[PDB]
Amino acid sequence: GKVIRTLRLQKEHWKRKHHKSKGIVGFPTLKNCEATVEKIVHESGRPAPLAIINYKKEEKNTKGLLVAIEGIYEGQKIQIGENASLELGNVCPIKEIPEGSLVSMVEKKPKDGGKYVKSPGCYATIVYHNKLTNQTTIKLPSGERVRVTGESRALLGIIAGGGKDDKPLLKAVNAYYKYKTKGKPWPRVRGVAMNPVDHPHGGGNHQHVGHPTTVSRNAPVNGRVGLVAARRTGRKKGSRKITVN
RNA sequence: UAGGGGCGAAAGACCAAUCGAACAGUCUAGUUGCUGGUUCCCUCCGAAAUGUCUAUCAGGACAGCGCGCACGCAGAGAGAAGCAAGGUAGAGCAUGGGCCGGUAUCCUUAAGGAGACGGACGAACUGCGAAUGUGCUUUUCUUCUAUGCAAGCGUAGUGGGCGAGUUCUGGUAAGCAGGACUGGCGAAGAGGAAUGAACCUGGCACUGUGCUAAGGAACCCAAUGUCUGGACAGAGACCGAAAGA
RNA sequence: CAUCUGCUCUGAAAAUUGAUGGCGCUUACCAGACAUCCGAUGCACAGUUAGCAGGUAGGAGGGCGUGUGUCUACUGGCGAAGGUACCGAGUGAUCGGUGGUGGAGGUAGAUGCAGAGCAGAUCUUGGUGGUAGUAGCGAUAAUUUGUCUUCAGCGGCAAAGACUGAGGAGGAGAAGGGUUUCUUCUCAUAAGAAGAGUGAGCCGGGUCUAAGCGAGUGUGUAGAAGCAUGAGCGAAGGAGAAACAGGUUGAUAUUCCUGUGCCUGUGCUGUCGUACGGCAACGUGUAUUAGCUUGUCGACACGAACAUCUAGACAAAGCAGAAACACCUUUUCUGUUCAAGGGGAAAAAGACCACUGAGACGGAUCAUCUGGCGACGUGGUUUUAUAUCUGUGACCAGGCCUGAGCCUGGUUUGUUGAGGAUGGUCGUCCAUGAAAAGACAACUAUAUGGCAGCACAGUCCGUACCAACCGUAUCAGGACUCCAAGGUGAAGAGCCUCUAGUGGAUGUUUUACACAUGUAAGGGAAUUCGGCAAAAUGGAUGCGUAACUUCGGGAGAAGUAUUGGUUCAAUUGUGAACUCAUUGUGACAAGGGGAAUCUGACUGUUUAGUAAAAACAUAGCUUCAUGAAGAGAGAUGAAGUGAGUUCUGCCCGGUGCUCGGUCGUGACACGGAGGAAAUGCCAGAAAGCACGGGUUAACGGCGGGAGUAACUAUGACUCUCUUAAGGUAGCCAAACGCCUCGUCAUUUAAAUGGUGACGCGCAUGAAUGGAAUGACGAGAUUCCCACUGUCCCUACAUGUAGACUAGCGAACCCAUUUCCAGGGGAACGGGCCUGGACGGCCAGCGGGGAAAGAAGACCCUGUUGAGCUUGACUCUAGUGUGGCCAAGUUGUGACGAUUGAGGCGAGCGCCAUGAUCAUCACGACACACUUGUUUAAGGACAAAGGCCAGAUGGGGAGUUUGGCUGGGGCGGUACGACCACAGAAUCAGAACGUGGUCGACCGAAGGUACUCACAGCGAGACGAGAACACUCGUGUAGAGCAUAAGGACUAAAGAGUGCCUGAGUGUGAGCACUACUGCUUGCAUGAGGGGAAACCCGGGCCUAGCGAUCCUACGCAUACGAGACACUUGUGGCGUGGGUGUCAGAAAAGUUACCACAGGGAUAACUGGCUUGUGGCCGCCGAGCGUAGAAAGCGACGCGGCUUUUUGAUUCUUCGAUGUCGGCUCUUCCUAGCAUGGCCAUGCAGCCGUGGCGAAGUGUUGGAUUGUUCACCCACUAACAGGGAACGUGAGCUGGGUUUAGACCGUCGUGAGACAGGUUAGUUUUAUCCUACUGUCCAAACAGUUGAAGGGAGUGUGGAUUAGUACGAAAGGAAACCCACACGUGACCUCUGGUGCAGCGGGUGUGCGGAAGUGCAACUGCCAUGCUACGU
RNA sequence: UAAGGAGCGAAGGAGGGCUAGAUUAUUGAGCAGCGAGAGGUGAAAUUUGAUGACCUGCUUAGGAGUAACAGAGGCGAAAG
């Protein structure tokens, strides 16, 4: 047969375009700074708003981008790095923040610029500090617990734009605007409605799959469709998670 | 974004009147056990549609039947006369299978059974047995025979057949399917059955005079009349049963 | 009288008209005989001749002709070759001469070399016919008259008549074209030839940057591709310094000329400058370069309402000129202009500054709103149009003259108003709506800078025209944009007009059949698969509006009434009166409505060119995988179901996916033992596999049999088999039910239909999603109201073609000689044989030419393909897993490998610890390697490369998927062997002919020598019986012989008993159609067997139990071995084993309804032919039955025929094509007689019937369900018989069924896919030829006639009278003449319907100044003549 | 007014809403010790344990609750 939809959309001419982008998002590199928030802006592909910051490096003014936490305003002064106060919207070394606190834009290793929590409405929880090894345990929004060194930086607050998934998209055109900038195929034609030249689920005198939909992790790429390496299937209840800090 | 690739609100849709794999050009005069065609005259000879093996059944090869060149040469698609083998037609029912009825007598019953016998029968019953056909010897056995036979060597076509008379098997039968024997049409014209591949007479270089065949002889149409019996039905010359006055 | 033989007779019925061959024959027949004649390519005689003589496929011998070579002989201007008429020679292929034409070359003989002879190939190229002066040439607005040319153009010009109608058939640009544009001449004409024509600082290109492309360099590659970075490039419609009026040419113009300007720079001469004002909001002053830095401009979505301006359009008055006047009118028409640049208001809308000090309150918008972070008020500051003036006069209208110049006007007011411009507000979004070049301000330094005059400069390329573009063209198609008047009306709708633009194949009143349209008595879907098509409804205003519902909707529900003109009131609500001959959204424009069911939620999308859908999409719902990112779990990808409401039961046995451990297996490397060494051997061994768990909103799956309740039925209850679990809740003859047209109710006169119920449901059912509704479908289906030419049943009229005529002018197709009936024939003839008939012409028509299209698409065959699937065969990319490979450095412990000095148990193995090399975790440093944490972080790990080895692998690649066969498939095996039967008494001998057997078994069931029988039957012998052991007599096999069938065997070949391993070893010859195989037989040998010996034995009493080349295993002796020699491996020879059952021997699964190619009537799906089982119809006999009684009527059990209208059986004709079911329409034939006419019998009183005979003239209907033929009901009737003609009839129609490609359901399949199972959507081409048929002319002067031959026509019902009669116990109950009607036939318009071309009238919208006369769009009342039936 | 409503003074109650804290207990994980059974009942089986249960230490993570004092005691319109 021919090449399936899933492979074609991974070729280079289909990658997302950057022409409307504001810049690369991430923290400054300097040990200490005082910054001012210049503007709060929407960026074409992203639902969380961005804040433009201004800080001096040598004598010269320089500009950066952060993801906005909820409760900043244009004109606010913010303090970055060691010796910053625990005030909403400051950036601090993680070892300085008390247990049970909520944080965003956490660095996985020092000076990486911030990864981890970046989507609207999300946060992470500080669950443990180890005074020997200088590690800290953070609980991520998937439920995963990960350990990071005390020298990493983090932003104090919750990411702006929460609640967005409460309102249903009642019409086809509303879905169109949401997926127009994403990589997923919309509208999505079902594999059982294709001919066998186009998809492993195609063909036959009734619309059916005909073979089990759970497939191996090591299966060849042009036929790896369906539920890939599923441990279980169906709507029944699972089992207890195992937890360590 | 480009061909075993694209693109698809999915129809195998669309990608320059081309898409269940584009166009141009080359390899390439790709291959073909299958269809079509294959160019002058006269003379002489003249088939086969069967057997064995084949991923064989619309094809091959080997053998059998033609022709050419021919070393050589007592032979013959016919009879007699001695001699073998055969189990069909007819005939029979003696081992085996198998239908109906029995006198005297016998056994029991007071029923039935057996029976000295008669009638009816078999592709896989036989005690007897033809005609026709087959083989052996003898030219020291009639009759024919050189314009004849012919080892050997080289090489062709053929390997869908069909029909008549006599017979057979399967089938209600069939211008049906399948065998055997002797001549045909295939590859055969001419005269006759009004017409007809195969039926009757009878086998063809080219002319002329006579005669016959088969079939005809009022007229169409070359040749026709006679004698004796039957027969009356718009009958017969061409044409159907059991049953009948 | 009874039998038998001959001829006649009865049994004896088929579809166009018919066949002893015809006409005829009764003395042309049947049977028995007789005469002699006619008749072959045969026979006789005679010529010619080698004479011996037919011939396909095929084979051989001798000759004729063509282009060129070598030689010999000749020839041509006193006319060569060629070509054309005649004449001679040869059996023939061919050859020779004569007369005209032609104008320079040509042969005869013998040999040599070949591109060496045509009727055909749907042959190749070129040229020409018939058809044929024919088919056609005419969609759109429309044309007439005069006059000149033209020389014969509806060409030009005047006057009329029309049309596009400002979302134009008008005026311009772009893409595309490229001289098509202008002048002259000529026809050569959508034709040529010769010239001429496009002028810029201010218009556009050359500039900037979007999405993006990229030279070079780095890395890579055999070279490439690719990847990282990046000079340069990327918009004639995005950003982008500065121009406008009026004139002029045959053709250019914001480009030329005149006038008035502007931008960017340069230079001269004058003339001034180095600062101030306001509480402030800010002003006055035309101001230099340069630089940091901060900001602004360039610089931006959609939608709605409200202001203001400008084009435009109206109406009054003034003047100037036009139109109209039988009448009337100060009625009607055209004009009334002002650019860029300069100067400049009031106004409206917002910002802001000073004073002031406000509320349970003031201000303010069409709408939101607004104020102590300062309201109202009073005075100011600033930003954004426009009117008006100047632009020095141009331009327009009119008058007077004129081959030129003068003169006069261009004045005032009101209403409205964009489809253009601008301003400040408001709404929407999980969508927030480009960059850069180039500018400007503030701040800091620095200063000869501003203005006026005059002068200079600004390169290069494009510039004509389009109705001329792409479709083979002068093609009804396609193709990016701009400007836009008046009336009617909501409206750049339709209809009518102004500005501007427009047109030719000719004449004829022109039948039939058409194509676009009108109208119709009475009836109203009766029509048809189906209301398909048409009709009906229609705008605005008011009254009045149901079920159900997600509460939004349904809803314009439905149902009803009103509407013109005039003259008034009243001011947006509307009222009232008067008036008209059909009435008023008058033309144009403009919904039919209701009740239910199946199905998809909705708007949206799709097979360009047969499918618009129930299919796809969609919002919502659920599952899966991941902490990797230029992205970071409210994320990023993969699947399934299909909005909302309400539910979503049970199963982890199989298959898959996933998790955990090894107990076993499982590669290469790395080790070990041995040997002179190679080859082998042993260990070792990840992941996988196996094993144990999880998982169905994963693939999917979800039962049988018996009994049992006070009538019968049914079974809550019991028992029994069975499993992974035995279909829960719901729903149903449903788009899913075979039987099936299921049963009951309702709808109709009548229901294979619809709806409601019921349910052991062939084969319903739960995100392979189940069930109940709303709103919305060009979706499928049933019914009702309105409405109608769909129909009964057709008639009349209009336009355009068509017929005839002038001008112009083709194609398909074609072996052609073409009237029928029967016969035969390749089984349906135009041509052949025997009969019936025989002409040409013009216009129509569709019976035939199995008419033309196109090497049948269905079906089979080919050792021909391609797309797609998987549990087919053999490989492969990707993904995982192991060991090894760039000398990192140094610590600690550990297991392991190798050998000593210790200890235990009757020097052994076992237990202690001490030295020698690898080596697995763990630490701590920095040097390889990694990362924009980069003057940095990690770190010998990772990540990325390389060489070998295992695992997985329809993601892909190649290929295969036997044969015979009463077509193929499914089934069997007639595919290798053996016996019997038949195949007309040797042997042989076919069919999916008949009855069967084989793929082995046995140390004896083999070899030998000797002994004796057997199966039964008749007597005996205790228990002991039907049947126990023992005896005597008979006993030709009635028994046995392992295993089919046949043959064979008696002191044995059978049953016993003894001994043996001949079921030896070498090597020959033969038989069965004879290779393999099986058997028969010769000679030589054994320290061979059995027997006294003669004799016998190298398997089974005989006929069946089996297999090549190459490779490999074993036995046997004799060989070979590379320069030489020794050994371990190897190679030769003979013979046996390991195996091919498709058995004279390849290594192999499906599907195509998406399909291709070569062929086949060697072979299926129609018709025809042969047959007639089965279907239908008729005879013979007489057992019984009929109230008696064979036979009025019947007729068992048996027997003989006919028919082709049923279905089989067979495969002769057609696969380079004979259009396939039913209906509609129309004609003819048959009889086996339903009605109607004449008769005979009766169990015939009469009435009504029943059985038969001669007879085919005239009849045999309207409907409901269904695609039906068929069936079954209702209504009528004299009666509602049965059939044929290529299952009559598609260049006659229709297209409901079946049978291409889309899609749903059930059952089957792992799947692609299947299903004489159900459902819905699905392109019907061409006559102009010949012949037939229908009419028309000629053959046939004119007037009057004749009648050969051909055609043919009237059929039936009722009433009255006989008559309440005959006849019958009664009840009942018949038989001419006359009159009324229906159907059919032929005519006719006096009457009555219908139609409206000629004729008279009326109104609506808009044109010609009014009235009168009238155009266009079309509407409407009456109606001559004519034609017609619903009339006579 | 030994009818009602407004108000003053000192005091009492598990009456109600909110904010910030608490002693144990029951489960779950981590690590350490030990080396065979634990659980449950009238009596037992499903079941769990050498991948170390049970029991004893130390760490942690959550979400409920307020024992004994506590009564013919108190409060509220009742539910509480």
Distance CA A228 to C1' C1300 in A = 41
Backbone angle region of A243, left / alpha / beta, with phi > 0 → left and psi within -120 to 50 → alpha: beta
Q: Which residues are registered as beta bridge partners of A3?
A: none
Q: What is the resolution of this structure in A?
A: 10.8
Q: Which nucleotides of D are covered by protein (CB under 7 A)?
A: 28-30, 60-62
Provide the CA A5 distance to its chain's centre, in angstroms: 25
Distance CA A71 to C1' C161 in A = 87
3-class SS at A12? Answer: helix
d(CA A94, CA A151): 7
Of A35, A32, A98, A44, which is closest to residue A62 (Cα–Cα)? A35
- Cα–Cα distance list, A191 to A81, A94, A194, A223 (Å): 52, 48, 5, 12
Whether residue A128 contacts residue A56, with contact meaning beta carbons closer than 8 Å, is answered with no
Listed by range, residues with Cβ under 7 angstroms from strand D are A 100, 127, 240, 242-245
Alpha helix segments (H runs only) across A27-133: none
Rounded to the nearest 5°, which phi and psi values hold at A63? -120, 145
Of A180, A204, A178, A176, which is closest to residue A191 (Cα–Cα)? A204
Place of tokens 């999505």: A188
Alpha helix segments (H runs only) across chain A: 5-8, 172-179
The DSSP symbol for A128 reads: E
Whether residue A126 contacts residue A94, with contact meaning beta carbons closer than 8 Å, is answered with yes
d(CA A217, CA A242): 24
The DSSP symbol for A212 reads: -
Q: Kind of pairing, strands A102-103 and A153-155?
A: unpaired
Tokens at residue A155, please? 């932003």
Place of tokens 């247990």: A99
- H helix or E strand, kind and range, residue A77: strand A77-81
